């Protein structure tokens, strides 16, 4: 069931990969057949092509990752993993390529959040087709080191922290009253006395009304009025019967309505996860069994390979070993004849050197060497020439040449053909369990035994050659020692804190960090936990922004234009939550979670984040840490306040954290409140501790030194709450990339409301106007949303939700209580995003004309 379905899914994924490879080969061959002229392909067509490629590769990624998640053939699994990492790499490269050509509207947007919605709808897929949840195999793969790291972390936490549950984000409530118990008692007493007096005076009013009615009835009876009493009961019974029959009719009407709801399909039939027979439970059990299956096959296949290599070496070890001994003896005899027993070999290694020259190989390599070294010959004559500036067309063609087959393209394609040739043509009917085949085991084990034999024979024939050379008493021509490895005092970039951690092994530094609370076990989280919608109408927002800017260009009043341009260009749609999830996943999970992607992608390990408090930065940090099983070290001034009071301790802690990250791979460093360390010095006297600002120099030198190796899968996290505090130039030049979390929109905010309300286990009303509350709540961050939702519902309130349906006014009070972000803050966030990201740089780029000249500049020398 699972094996066959996953075989078909891999089949479809390889079909998609072959479709993309043929598609992209199409431009190269078309160019080859039409290389004569230039190509006037607008950025629109290239954008469509790369976006379709990106979406198809996303589908391939989804299918392949799920297959490896539930692919049980370890030989098949290894191929799936390598192909998946190669596809992930070319996917990141495709995303970058789409980023570069984001020149829509006749502009130069180098946006990390390209808009593919128009293609998405044109291609008949919903936005969720772009989802790229972070693969979960980053943990199982080489899980030993990370599991040991987590074991040590928990041991240290018990050593000092005394707690094991992952710390949750404790948000201090500003609703605390600094009053003595007497004040609260008096307030409660005033409340109770007021309400009791109200009740008693209401009773007095009721008694007055009763007296008035008694007087009126007495006056009426004084008139001798007779009122029939028998008919009153009959009238009451008739009215009650009519109302009861109407109620029966109505209840039956809504019963039929709900029957139509369930049958014709109005209300979804939600499956409770807790029930024993939930379909999700069956799927989870099957996945658990299947995964244990992949590990069982892995272990038994490793044991089979070990035993097979043992038996192979035992049976065919001595024989071919002696044969290659004889070959080495013959080569030594030929060597002696060539030197006439005067100069003999020292190592049989050159035996390979004389047999590396493959006929066809010698041809290919001789041609390549001649062609390469030919270019070196011409580098001697023309030197007096000038150093002329680069031509515009030269670089335009160099960076506009349609890229050919990337090497990773070659890797992925060739893997596809080899899998098709070997495993597709493999008859699994006899091997119904899809376990390893002995043939592949032998084929891939032969290298191990052969190389073991080669090493043993190399040693043995080394002794043989020594003895043979001594036989003729051939004095060993003194082996001139290679220049003594002077360990020069190279000025390796010295970082703060080295003095206090010299001679200490990593475990002691880890214990110190744990005792210092810098490192904490953050609550596990998933990237798909970031409830977010795709930029469905982001492109239309961009079109409207461009049109409004063009209309502004037509304006005549200089003052009006200056005022309009001073305020941030709100017309630009902010990066989508789906786009932000994609960017974070691609930049962190694959590099942090994959070594091959780290090598094959841009070597960046510095991310900055700008957003309102609780807007989801902690959610992203938790999701990444849980998915990649990475230690999170928060050096935020708030998380370290009250413990560091000198520069030496900060330097030592930074050095220890960096060393842990380098050696405790994977590792991640998070730091909030970055403004106090890189804020505006000229500003007023901030209440924050000045000591935090000193972190700039140590981190500055670290960044300028390239401390973390580009392939090393460790990243530094910078997320702030108020972007305007930090220096924009330093932010631009000090972090590899920056991300701004947009305020929730109508659709995304409403969906977040629905997700939280379902999370709290509150019933869903049919006539509830979600978008009304969405409008009422505009201007609040995600953290404020969560805080208000938690505040509104309590234990008894949640237990009483059935009796009282959710009411609009319930959210009226809390919304004002939680922190509120004014439109000015959003405008400043957008301005900082445009400036630090450099979008304003492009804006200024595409407005200055080229008419202005470079004339006289020498007269004004006085």
């Amino acid at each position: 069931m699972s094996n066959m379905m996953y075989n078909m899914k891999w089949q479809e994924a390889i079909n998609d990969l072959m479709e993309q490879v043929t598609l992209e080969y199409l431009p190269l061959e078309q160019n080859e057949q039409q290389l004569g002229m230039k190509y006037k392909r607008d950025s629109s067509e290239w954008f469509h092509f790369w976006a379709t490629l990106y979406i198809k590769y996303i589908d391939i990624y989804k299918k392949l990752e799920d297959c490896y998640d539930q692919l049980v053939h370890p030989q098949k699994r290894v191929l799936l993993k390598e192909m998946l990492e190669n596809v992930i790499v070319r996917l990141c490269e495709t995303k970058s390529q789409v980023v570069k050509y984001n020149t829509q509207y006749d502009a130069t947007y180098k946006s990390d959040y390209p808009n593919l919605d128009e293609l998405v709808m044109d291609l008949k897929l919903t936005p969720d087709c772009l989802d790229i949840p972070i693969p979960r195999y980053f943990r199982e793969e080489d899980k030993k080191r990370l599991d040991e790291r987590n074991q040590i972390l928990d041991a240290l936490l018990l050593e000092y922290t005394d707690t094991k549950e992952p710390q949750e984000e404790q948000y201090e409530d500003q609703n605390t009253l600094q009053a003595d118990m007497d004040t609260a008692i008096r307030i409660i007493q005033r409340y109770e006395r007021g309400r009791q007096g109200i009740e008693r005076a209401n009773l007095a009013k009721i008694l007055k009304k009763e007296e008035e009615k008694k007087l009126e009835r007495q006056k009426k009876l004084a008139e001798g009025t007779e009122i029939g009493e028998e008919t009153e009961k009959d009238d009451a019974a008739l009215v009650i019967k009519k109302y009861w029959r109407g109620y029966k009719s109505r209840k039956l009407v809504q019963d039929i309505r709900e029957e139509e709801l369930l049958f014709l399909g109005m209300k979804k039939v939600v499956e409770d996860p807790t029930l024993p027979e939930s379909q999700y439970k069956q799927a989870q059990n099957k996945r658990q069994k299947m995964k244990y299956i992949q590990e069982e096959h892995e272990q038994e296949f490793n044991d089979e390979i070990e035993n097979l290599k043992r038996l192979v070496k035992g049976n065919e070890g001595p024989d071919i070993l002696d044969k290659m001994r004889a070959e080495r003896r013959e080569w030594i005899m030929r060597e002696l004849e060539k030197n006439e027993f005067k100069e003999a070999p020292q190592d049989p290694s050159e035996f390979y050197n004389q047999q590396v020259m493959d006929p066809e190989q010698q041809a290919a390599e001789a041609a390549k060497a001649a062609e390469e070294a030919k270019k070196k010959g011409a580098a001697k004559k023309d030197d007096k020439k000038k150093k002329g500036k680069p031509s515009e067309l030269d670089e335009f063609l160099e960076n506009n040449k349609p890229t050919g087959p990337s090497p990773i393209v070659l890797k992925l394609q060739e893997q596809i053909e080899k899998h098709s040739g070997e495993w597709s043509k493999r008859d699994e009917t006899n091997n119904f369990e899809q376990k390893h085949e002995t043939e592949l085991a032998k084929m891939l084990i032969k290298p191990v035994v052969e190389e073991q034999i080669k090493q043993q024979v190399d040693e043995m024939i080394a002794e043989e050659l020594d003895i043979v050379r001594l036989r003729y008493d051939i004095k060993k021509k003194k082996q001139k020692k290679p220049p003594r490895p002077r360990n020069k005092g190279k000025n390796k970039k010295k970082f703060p804190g080295d003095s206090s951690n010299k001679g200490r092994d990593p475990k002691d530094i880890l214990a110190g960090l744990v005792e210092k609370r810098v490192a904490k076990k953050l609550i596990p989280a998933s990237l798909m936990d970031l409830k977010g919608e795709q930029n469905v109408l982001g492109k239309i927002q961009e079109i409207q922004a461009d049109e409004n800017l063009k209309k502004t260009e037509a304006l005549t009043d200089a003052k009006l234009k200056k005022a309009q341009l001073e305020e941030p260009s709100t017309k630009m749609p902010d990066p989508s939550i789906a786009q932000i999830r994609q960017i974070i996943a691609e930049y962190i999970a694959f590099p942090l979670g994959s070594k091959y992607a780290k090598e094959k992608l841009d070597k960046m390990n510095y991310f900055f984040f700008m957003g309102p408090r609780g807007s989801g930065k902690t959610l992203a940090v938790r999701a990444l840490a849980h998915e990649c099983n990475a230690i999170v070290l928060d050096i935020s001034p708030s998380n370290i306040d009250g413990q560091y009071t000198d520069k030496k301790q900060i330097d030592g802690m930074i050095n220890s954290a960096f060393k842990v990250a380098k050696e405790f791979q994977p590792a991640i460093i998070y730091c909030e409140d970055f403004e106090y360390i890189f804020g505006q010095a000229k500003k007023k006297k901030s209440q924050v501790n000045p000591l935090f600002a000193k972190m700039k120099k140590p981190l500055m030198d670290f960044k300028k030194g390239k401390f973390f190796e580009p392939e090393d899968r460790v990243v530094f996290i910078g997320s702030t709450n108020r972007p305007w505090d930090c220096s924009q130039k330093e932010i631009k030049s000090f972090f590899d990339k920056k991300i701004y979390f947009p305020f929730p929109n109508y659709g995304t905010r409403m969906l977040l409301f629905k997700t939280f309300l379902e999370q709290k286990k509150v019933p869903l009303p049919d006539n509830f106007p979600i978008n009304t509350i969405a409008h009422i709540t505009e201007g609040w961050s995600a953290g404020s949303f969560k805080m208000a939702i938690d505040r509104v519902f309590t234990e008894r309130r949640l237990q009483k939700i059935n009796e009282e349906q959710i009411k609009l006014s319930e959210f009226i009070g809390p919304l004002s209580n939680v922190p509120f972000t004014s439109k000015e803050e959003f405008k400043e966030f957008k301005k900082f995003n445009q400036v630090v990201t450099g979008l304003q740089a492009n804006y200024e780029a595409k407005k200055a004309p080229a008419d202005d000249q470079k004339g006289d500049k020498n007269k004004k020398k006085k």
Binding site: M1, M4, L261, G265, M266, K268, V269, K286, F432
Partner: protein
């Protein structure tokens, strides 16, 4: 929208039902193949009972 939500939900439910049907089908097929091989070996052992 309610129509399409529930039609999608019921279609997914029927997809899960067909998935379970298929899984049970492979279960029964594997059971029958195991019996097939078992009886084949039992006949080959009857070719020894015939020696007896």
């Amino acid at each position: 929208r309610d129509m399409v939500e529930n039609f999608y939900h019921n279609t997914l439910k029927e997809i899960s039902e067909v998935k379970t049907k298929i899984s049970n089908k492979e279960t029964e097929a594997e059971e029958k193949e195991s019996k097939h091989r078992i009886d084949v070996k039992v006949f080959l052992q009857k070719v020894k009972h015939l020696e007896y």
